[PDB]
């Protein structure tokens with residue numbers, strides 16, 4: 316079939332949903348695409364290059380709240396950005412594990428730059444703007460990885476018995492949205508404080 | 514050599530540091546222990562059982578701040594507990610990835626139960642006590658996984674150029690400790706607020 320980049324990635328995402336990350340391999344991708352392995356090699360050199368590319372495309376395709384809206388508060392931006400990120404990572408099996416193993420590529424350069432500019436434009440130091448954005452990223456990745464790794468390993472004292480029932484009410488969206496507000500407020504308190512002891 | 518549980522786990526942790534998680538296998542563990550694979554099988558049925566056991570032992574061996582000190586505030590406990598957890602996960606290559614794929618086993622039952630009791634004893638609902646503890650866990654796991662997955666994939670616009678230099682000052686300990694305070698304060702604001710709009 317077609318072996319342009321878009322088509323290769325489509326097939327690889329499809330395979331990722333079928334196999335998970337650990338079971339994703341260039342060999343199986345070749346089969347999915349009806350080609351021989353050396354033909355695939357011309358296009359895709361190894362699994363690492365594949366994964367690097369999938370991370371980028373997962374977000375490009377599905378992380379639709381990369382940038383602040385006109386007039387938007389930084390609180391609101393961070394909330395909307397976290398929810399978008401989380402959505403995009405949940406979209407494919409092992410999506411968060413695919414995203415972990417990567418740094419921003421060129422075309423994300425400009426998206427993350429803007430986000431850091433925006434933070435600095437709202438009273439954050441580069442560093443604190445960065446810590447904020449990274450805390451949100453880490454919290455979100457950590458939380459998605461625990462849904463996704465939960466359900467992957469699948470295939471009592473009373474409070475805990477009940478915590479584990481409450482912790483399975485929904486997918487983790489409640490505990491995530493609650494924590495996200497906590498984190499944002501925490502940032503706000505810090506920003507506000509300037510040099511006052513806080 | 515000796516194939517009691519303790520000895521098997523010691524060798525497996527040692528192998529984990531040598532190979533990483535993806536490259537850890539029962540076959541290689543057998544070799545490390547100078548035994549044949551079917552001999553290992555008697556003791557260790559597969560990689561999943563191994564990993565389950567490693568997660569438990571990583572924390573048992575190294576997560577030394579599982580419980581609040583007498584008189585300790587819940588703020589302080591959460592801080593000390595997060596720092597302990599983080600330390601323990603960083604101790605072995607792919608430590609956080611090893612921890613992800615697991616639920617508390619029996620002997621952790623009582624440790625996590627206590628922690629949730631303690632939260633409830635300090636004014637939290639079970640649920641909020643739970644969200645707090647899980648937000649901390651997810652933030653910490655997310656942050657460690659990003660150190661560990663960073664260095665594993667290894668083997669510019671100006672703000673970002675500089676964010677990436679600042680983001681490599683230390684291992685991630687600064688950005689983690691900063692975010693942790695933000696998260697704790699966020700929790701405190703929530704607890705304090707009771708039913709007031711906040």
Ligand SMILES: CN(C)[C@@H]1C(O)=C(C(N)=O)C(=O)[C@@]2(O)C(=O)C[C@@H]([C@]3(C)OC(=O)c4c(O)ccc(Cl)c43)C[C@@H]12
Nearest residue numbers: 374378381396397400418419423426427448449451452
């Ligand atoms: C979820 N958001 C907060 C960010 C985001 O919106 C994007 C995105 N592509 O639109 C990211 O790449 C993020 O989701 C994201 O994963 C990256 C992350 C950050 C700070 O920027 C980086 O370039 C970078 C890095 O190289 C290593 C670690 C970390 Cl935490 C980062 C910024 C993230």
Ligand SMILES: CN(C)[C@@H]1C(O)=C(C(N)=O)C(=O)[C@@]2(O)C(=O)C[C@@H]([C@]3(C)OC(=O)c4c(O)ccc(Cl)c43)C[C@@H]12
Nearest residue numbers: 572576579594595598616617621624625646647649650
């Ligand atoms: C880092 N700490 C906050 C906790 C902790 O001290 C321990 C520990 N063994 O001492 C945990 O197991 C923790 O580090 C930990 O990883 C678990 C975590 C929690 C809420 O309890 C659970 O039993 C549980 C679960 O089954 C699934 C997801 C989550 Cl987030 C959890 C509690 C964690």
Ligand SMILES: [Cl-]
Nearest residue numbers: 316317318322
């Ligand atoms: Cl075709």
Ligand SMILES: [Cl-]
Nearest residue numbers: 317318319322
């Ligand atoms: Cl075409």
Ligand SMILES: [Cl-]
Nearest residue numbers: 316317318319
């Ligand atoms: Cl083609």
Ligand SMILES: [Cl-]
Nearest residue numbers: 319320321322
């Ligand atoms: Cl294309």
Ligand SMILES: [Cl-]
Nearest residue numbers: 341361362363
């Ligand atoms: Cl390969």
Ligand SMILES: [Cl-]
Nearest residue numbers: 514515516520
């Ligand atoms: Cl011996």
Ligand SMILES: [Cl-]
Nearest residue numbers: 515516517520
């Ligand atoms: Cl002995």
Ligand SMILES: [Cl-]
Nearest residue numbers: 514515516517
């Ligand atoms: Cl023996």
Ligand SMILES: [Cl-]
Nearest residue numbers: 517518519520
């Ligand atoms: Cl033993």
Ligand SMILES: [Cl-]
Nearest residue numbers: 539559560561
């Ligand atoms: Cl196996």
